[PDB]
RNA sequence: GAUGUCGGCUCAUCACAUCCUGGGGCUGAAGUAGGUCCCAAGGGUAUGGCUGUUCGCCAUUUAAAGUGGUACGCGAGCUGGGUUUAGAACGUCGUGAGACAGUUCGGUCCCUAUCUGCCGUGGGCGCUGGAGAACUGAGGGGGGCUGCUCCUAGUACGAGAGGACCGGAGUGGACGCAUCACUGGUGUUCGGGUUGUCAUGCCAAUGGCACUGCCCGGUAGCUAAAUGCGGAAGAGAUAAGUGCUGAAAGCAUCUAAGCACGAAACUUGCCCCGAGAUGAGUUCUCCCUGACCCUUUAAGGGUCCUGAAGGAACGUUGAAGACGACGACGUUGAUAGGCCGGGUGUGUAAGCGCAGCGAUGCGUUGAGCUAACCGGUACUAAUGAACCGUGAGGCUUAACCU
RNA sequence: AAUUCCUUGUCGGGUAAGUUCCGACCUGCACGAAUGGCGUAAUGAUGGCCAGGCUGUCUCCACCCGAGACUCAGUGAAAUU
RNA sequence: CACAGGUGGUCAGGUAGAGAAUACCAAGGCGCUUGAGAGAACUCGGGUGAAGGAACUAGGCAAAAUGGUGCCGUAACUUC
RNA sequence: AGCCGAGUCGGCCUGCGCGGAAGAU
């Protein structure tokens, strides 16, 4: 349950540290996010070197959450923080090398298989 | 088609090999036995009426007793009806069960919803509260206006205001059938129905 | 908010048409000593359905 | 309700072990990628159990890859294959929410040896 | 809404209920007829009929729930002494509530109760 | 001898000169995508930064972020930032008291609803002997939104670059109804930990007060963030528009006589109310089968005998409820309370024994206690009776039985 | 600028986006030297602007504990017409 | 008005506590001159809240939060 | 006019009608 003014962590190597959300894509009127879901963002900190720099604006998918999933037969699976990975603004691909933490099979499309296939683990 | 009169039992879940769980309400539906036939040159119309259940026997007037024993059935809790066909026909008499919906798969199910009285318009309506600080004087949960001005000097008819919620008859369309069960007399459906534990439901195959 | 005329005593008389009492329908009678009293209450000597209670 | 006592009865499992609050457990999954099925574990801390029939669940915590996780398990649905207890613990509740704001040293357990 | 509940408030807070209930048991228990209103004497049988159950046993134990629950010697030596062995054979039902007239102050219905072997 | 004036919040209703979705003619219309005019009002139609702002500029979304009327809709519905009292200061004008559609800081928003109107809910009488049920449907309300991906197909079109109509399948946003099986919130009526002080003679064990003293968990019920379902397809008559046959006018012409197509607008199909529809409708069952007198002689009055079918009143009460109303039950009985067995929650009671100098630990022991839940059981309370309601139901004409 | 009409002047900083805020420029409509000019540590229920913590202020409301409102018995007003 | 307002001086017990603060008690004094039921909307005074955390608003208005003693350690500027 | 046999062309004056014609309970 992700929505505007939200502050995240960064699950890969782009140099970015905190990240805000400022707007959910979709359709008219939309309330939250969840896994699997694209955002807008804005950077608020980023290590000195990296390739991001404080103050872009650029897209991003959401990876874990405190709310968590719901799978058919009941079943919930919950994390400890909220954290996204950064994509770019047109192609709407990763910008990094490296995955950190755990995932989740919500992400087994066409569209973010590189992430299923750079994390250490799909849960 | 005909359908039939049971009572809600309650609510479970059935597991799937697959590792799927699908929420189901149970209805019981015991044998409708039929009361009189309704026919054009008499009254109007096509249609049947059928009982079911049991009642006491110091409960049951004369004219209602009379009118069993016309038939020559048993007495049940109850009187109901159901509009005929092209090509239906059933005899005085006659018992129903729920084999009938053996090759059906989609349902309605019409029941009394449970009451909540005297309602106000943010929980009938979901009207918006005003604000609860920044100096509000008395009117948090308050309807707001009601019209305008000199023109045209009245309320108009419609208006949603604060009065009684629930306690009406409701039908939900289109459920899935899940289970038929002939020995038990038992019919499991997907989803929620209408109503309260132990009250009277009646089901038909869906219209649309 | 106040009236702007004065309300008539035929509308003071159709207002009121509702405030008539109701009396009691009838009374029991003890099967011992005979006293009449309210049903399902007990009697003003202290009996009840035939048996001294209250002494 | 007796009609929904038989049509719950005849949908448990009887292989249930028996397990407490405050121990580790194993638990075996299936996973379906494409048209195979393979198990898969996940390892932990019972902090909570709900006893209510075919309708009991039990909630397990780990810390993988830095980052803490939580499982709550449905007991009689056949995702599960098996369930193995690998430490008896001894603890004086019966929900450990507590261990949400502690790690490292501060976060262990007692073990129980009746 | 209050669909399946169960307790009256009787327009006090539930301290001042509970101190109430207390004392009207011991009364209860001490003079063995009482008069009150109808809606108390029906509130009184859930307070009242549970200490005979629990008196039918004799433990140091039982002894102790007792003075917890009235806290008073002179109620807890009668209970477990003499209102036990006269109850020992009975399923339930220990009192007995009869409805008399109209208070003069208030108009309120009143009630007497009793134990049943009076 | 008083009609409260800007902007915001809450809640709306109408028009069509149409912002989106629907149907068309022309194009300097190859395709994709555009320009202009005609028909159409069913539904839908952004969140933020700045400023008292309505506007406006800027950031990021959407199928789209329409234009107007309603005392520039709405203060006996809310606010009080701006304007428009009394305090004080700056610049400017005046010798001065003072002044400025110039600026700056501060500055009391009253009313228990008689009548109309609107949302809900009852009492009376009527419908022509009385009573218990099931219906028909004149009429009225609710609902009607839309994105993206895939196949057809890299086909039609095009030098290339690009890239469809028509027709099928899946998955979403916003909105509406119901429900509590699952995930959770609450749970001062259930269990436990602990600080200060007072009491039960004292130890041990317990209770009162300090926001439920402060906290940690949690049953039933209620509930959204939870999970089921919905908007249609079909039919009739049409709008702009497209046509067939065919004269007036030997040719031509969609029209004058005849015949065929055509849209989210109209009438139906889906859901709910509905015979006070005074035009008061229909079907099934049940109940009542005695004697006299008077008078102004008639839809007249009275006296004895008789009191049915059913209803009401009283009591025990409900997932029904402001009060009325509605549903279940009253010994030929499970309606409520209690009692017996389970379940659930909390988490190893008291007493006694052992180890230790002691605070404490171990055994008896997953122990004791356990609300509103499930399955059973006449122990307590639901009394025999009294009360209301009658005794075969008007006149005229027609058609069949006698 | 407690002073500037034109005016949200132009340039720099802070925000994704700043008619307010901070630093400069000088074209001072209409600053200026005891109806004082320019600075200043400490003090202020004084005016303006930005951050950390924190939250039912808000997205968007849900449940509970008390006092009224509702029903019965006793007493018993007001404005207005 | 048998009115939640105003009115100078003296006396000073116990356990915690810096204390005439605050909590619980002693001597002593009181339950405040309408009651009884029920457990609707709405208003008044309070307790708890998933995920987010000023997105509210003229303005963080109101609420929430910090809070004791002993010790370690503490910047620009300054009339020292 | 179209591919044989009686009418046909267009200006003027005048009576009644048709289009031009979109609004808020
Ligand atoms: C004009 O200045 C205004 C007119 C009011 S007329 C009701 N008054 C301001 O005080």
Redesign the pocket.
Known sequence: ???????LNVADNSGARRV?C???????????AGVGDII?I???EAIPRGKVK??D?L?AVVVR????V?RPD???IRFD??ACVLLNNNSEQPIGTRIFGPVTRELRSEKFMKIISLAPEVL | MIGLVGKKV????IFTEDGV???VTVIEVEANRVT?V?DLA????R?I?VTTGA?????V???????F??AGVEAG?????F?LAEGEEFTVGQSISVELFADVKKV?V??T???????????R????????????????????????????????????????????????????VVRVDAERNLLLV??????????DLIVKPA?? | ???????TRS?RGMRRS?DA?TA????????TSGEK?????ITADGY??GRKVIA | ??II?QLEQEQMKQDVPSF??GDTVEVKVWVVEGSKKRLQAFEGVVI??????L?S?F?VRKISNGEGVER?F?THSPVVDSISVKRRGAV????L??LRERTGKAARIKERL? | ???????????????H???MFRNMAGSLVRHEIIKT????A?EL??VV??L??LAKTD????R??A??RT?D?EIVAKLFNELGPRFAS??????????CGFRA?????MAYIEL?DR
């Open positions: 349950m992700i929505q505007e003014q939200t502050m805000m400022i707007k959910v894509l979709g359709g008219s009127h939309r309330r939250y807008k804005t950077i608020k404080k103050g604006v897209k959450t405190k709310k968590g719901r009941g079943s919930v923080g909220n | 309650g609510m479970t879940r769980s699908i929420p009189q309704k008499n009254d109007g119309y249609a009426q009642k006491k026997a110091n409960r007037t004369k004219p209602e007793a009379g009118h024993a016309k809790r109850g009187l109901w009806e509009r309605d019409t029941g919803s449970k009451g909540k009285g005297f309602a106000g318009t943010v929980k309506w979901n009207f918006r509260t005003q604000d609860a600080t920044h100096g509000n004087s008395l009117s948090h949960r308050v309807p707001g206006s009601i019209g305008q001005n000199q023109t045209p000097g009245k309320v108009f008819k419609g208006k949603k205001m604060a009065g009684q919620m629930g306690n009406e008859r409701v039908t939900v369309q289109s459920l899935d997907k989803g929620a129905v209408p109503g309260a534990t132990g009250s219209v649309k | 908010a106040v009236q702007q005329n004065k309300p509308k509702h009492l009691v329908t009838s009374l029991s009678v003890d099967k009293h309210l049903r399902h209450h009840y359905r | 309700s007796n006592k407490r609050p909570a159990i709900r006893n209510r029939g309708h669940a909630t709550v449905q004086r509740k019966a929900k929410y507590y009746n | 809404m209050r669909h399946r509940k169960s307790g009256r408030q009787l327009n006090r807070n539930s301290s209920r509970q101190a209103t109808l809606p108390k029906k049988r859930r009929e549970p005979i159950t433990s140091v134990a039982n102790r729930l003075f917890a806290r010697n009975r399923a339930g039902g220990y009192t007995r509530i009869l409805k102050g208030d108009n309120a219905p049943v």
